Structure of Estrogen receptor:
Amino acid sequence: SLALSLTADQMVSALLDAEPPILYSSMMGLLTNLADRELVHMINWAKRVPGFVDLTSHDQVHLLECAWLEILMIGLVWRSMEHPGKLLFAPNLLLDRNQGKCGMVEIFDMLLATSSRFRMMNLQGEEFVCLKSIILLNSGVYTFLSSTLKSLEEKDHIHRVLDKITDTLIHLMAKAGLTLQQQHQRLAQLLLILSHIRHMSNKGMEHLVPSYDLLLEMLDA
Amino acid sequence: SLALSLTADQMVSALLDAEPPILYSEYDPTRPFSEASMMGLLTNLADRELVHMINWAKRVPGFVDLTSHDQVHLLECAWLEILMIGLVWRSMEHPGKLLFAPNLLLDRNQGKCVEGMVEIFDMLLATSSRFRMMNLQGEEFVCLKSIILLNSGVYTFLSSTLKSLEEKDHIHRVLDKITDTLIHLMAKAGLTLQQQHQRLAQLLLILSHIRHMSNKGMEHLYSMKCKNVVPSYDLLLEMLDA
């Protein structure tokens, strides 16, 4: 696999080049329309994450099904980082906590706390794209229902690519001048935030969705 | 605080010494189970485990330095993840089965007894299988369990004040200490720097799946109107105070 042969710098370059554009905008009507448009770009992005297209179509879809809302959320948090107290859904749709008032406010608050954490950590764009790719590969990897040799090979492949992204994160940190200790600490801090992003996605899903079949068709096209 | 002064070896020792006991399910013969009776047994067991979890939490270095309020917030967010990771750990050497207790070892098909239970069973079994495939060690397990306790609720402190920022900072420092501890255990076991960082990542990424399982488990516990079976703020506070 070409993905497992990438250096840290090539992995970053490939991920930065794959980044979808920032899109423009009844509040739920506007968010829904925006999310719908974002989804098409997310599929194209996923196909460019090194390692992803090596998987069967079925496994690609499973991964997108599990990760789609976390991916939208982490993008939102990233866009909102420089706007304390506000969520930048789009450049023309910047909302503060009070506008979250319609259990919308609960999720708003969680998103704001994530943005605040990213800001306090001085999260870099290179780190962001790594984390977003981790979400895509990791979120669905533990819920593959299959026990065929193929499924075992797919899971192993995902874990190898995830290891590559870990190596990439550590490289970016060493280059930035962090000590070995600081490198491991920051890697941990970044990965632990992913647990909170999962939580937010689960709560978001309760409040609320692309089907397996819809995602498969979008991937095939 | 003397938690931030511990070496990696003292952190491990303190965590190993804090481990709660393995409890038995009600000696309660009646088999096979109904949906109601299985949930009755799991609920009773979980209730009894909760008291020991609070005693355990109080012995996680750094935890008692936090206000009582923050301690409860953390336990509120983490309790089901902690029960689950314990279950997964106990089940590691029993492929295809969940060891709820030494006298309550269930296979996938017994999950079907409770509607919606089988999906979560399958998730738990997959986690046990991943731990087995990674050859997860006891010292690593206790570190991961303490991370869950300190991490799960840390991002949902409403934090207006300098005090809240000091509490969060303290938690993040203790979490950094547990990370250092995990890496130390790995270096001692002979892993290269690269292998150390990779394994740390692999372990922390499983925590996202444990969160997911907790969230799904919480839904199911509501969905079968067990609403007042999640421990209340007040219950957790009283258990902490005692």
